[PDB]
Amino acid sequence: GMTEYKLVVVGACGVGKSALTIQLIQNHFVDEYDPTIEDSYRKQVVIDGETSLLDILDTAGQEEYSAMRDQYMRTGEGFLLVFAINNTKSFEDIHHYREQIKRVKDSEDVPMVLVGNKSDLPSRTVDTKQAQDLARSYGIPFIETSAKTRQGVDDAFYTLVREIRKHK
Ligand SMILES: */C=C\C(=O)N1CC(N2CCN(C(=O)CNc3cc(C4(C)CC4)c(Cl)cc3O)CC2)C1
Numbered sequence: 001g002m003t004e005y006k007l008v009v010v011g012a013c014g015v016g017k018s019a020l021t022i023q024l025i026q027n028h029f030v031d032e033y034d035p036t037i038e039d040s041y042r043k044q045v046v047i048d049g050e051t052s053l054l055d056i057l058d059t060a061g062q063e064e065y066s067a068m069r070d071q072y073m074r075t076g077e078g079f080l081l082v083f084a085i086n087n088t089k090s091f092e093d094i095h096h097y098r099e100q101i102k103r104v105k106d107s108e109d110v111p112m113v114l115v116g117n118k119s120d121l122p123s124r125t126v127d128t129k130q131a132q133d134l135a136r137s138y139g140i141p142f143i144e145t146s147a148k149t150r151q152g153v154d155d156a157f158y159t160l161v162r163e164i165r166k167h168k
């Protein structure tokens with residue numbers, strides 16, 4: 001059929017995973033989205049002239065790391081590592097998410113993008129420099145987003161597709 005990318009949105013509770021997903025899919029900001037609901041949504045896009053379908057998995061719920069769940073996560077082709085720029089713990093968590101993804105994929109070369117969300121807030125506690133430097137050490141792109149204003153949303157997901165398209 002037509003080209004498909006499975007993109008998995010990860011990161012701590014409350015960082016804006018669901019809001020980023022729904023902004024990408026239907027261009028509206030959701031204020032309240034149940035943190036236990038993990039759903040996927042598919043969107044037709046055109047990225048660098050190539051039509052494709054993005055299958056976006058908005059991860060949620062309990063943090064349980066089992067063989068079956070690992071194998072399910074392994075079906076993701078690229079991962080958005082999302083933290084919130086006003087939540088230092090969510091940034092500290094990022095390496096844990098990354099290491100679990102590498103483990104399940106049996107690869108140190110998995111397509112990923114680091115996303116600092118909630119850029120519209122007055123309350124930053126994570127410096128852009130620190131997140132850029134982390135992403136550089138990982139060899140992956142860094143995007144800042146606001147699911148509220150939509151700034152950076154398409155850049156984050158389309159950058160992740162472009163990372164997948166490099167992947168050997
Ligand atoms: C407040 C709820 C919420 O938004 N979230 C909890 C946090 N994660 C949800 C998804 N999750 C798991 O399902 C644990 N299993 C698991 C996850 C991964 C990832 C790191 C998500 C890719 C992998 Cl690779 C394997 C397995 O088994 C973690 C916590 C978001």
Ligand SMILES: Nc1nc2c(ncn2[C@@H]2O[C@H](COP(=O)(O)OP(=O)(O)O)[C@@H](O)[C@H]2O)c(=O)[nH]1
Nearest residue numbers: 013014015016017018019030031118146147148
């Ligand atoms: N100001 C602001 N609030 C946001 C943004 N993204 C998410 N939120 C709010 O942050 C809370 C958590 O968002 P949610 O999408 O549920 O995060 P998730 O737990 O990672 O799925 C909600 O009240 C959202 O409306 C953002 O970019 N800016």
Ligand SMILES: [Mg+2]
Nearest residue numbers: 017018035060
């Ligand atoms: Mg959610």
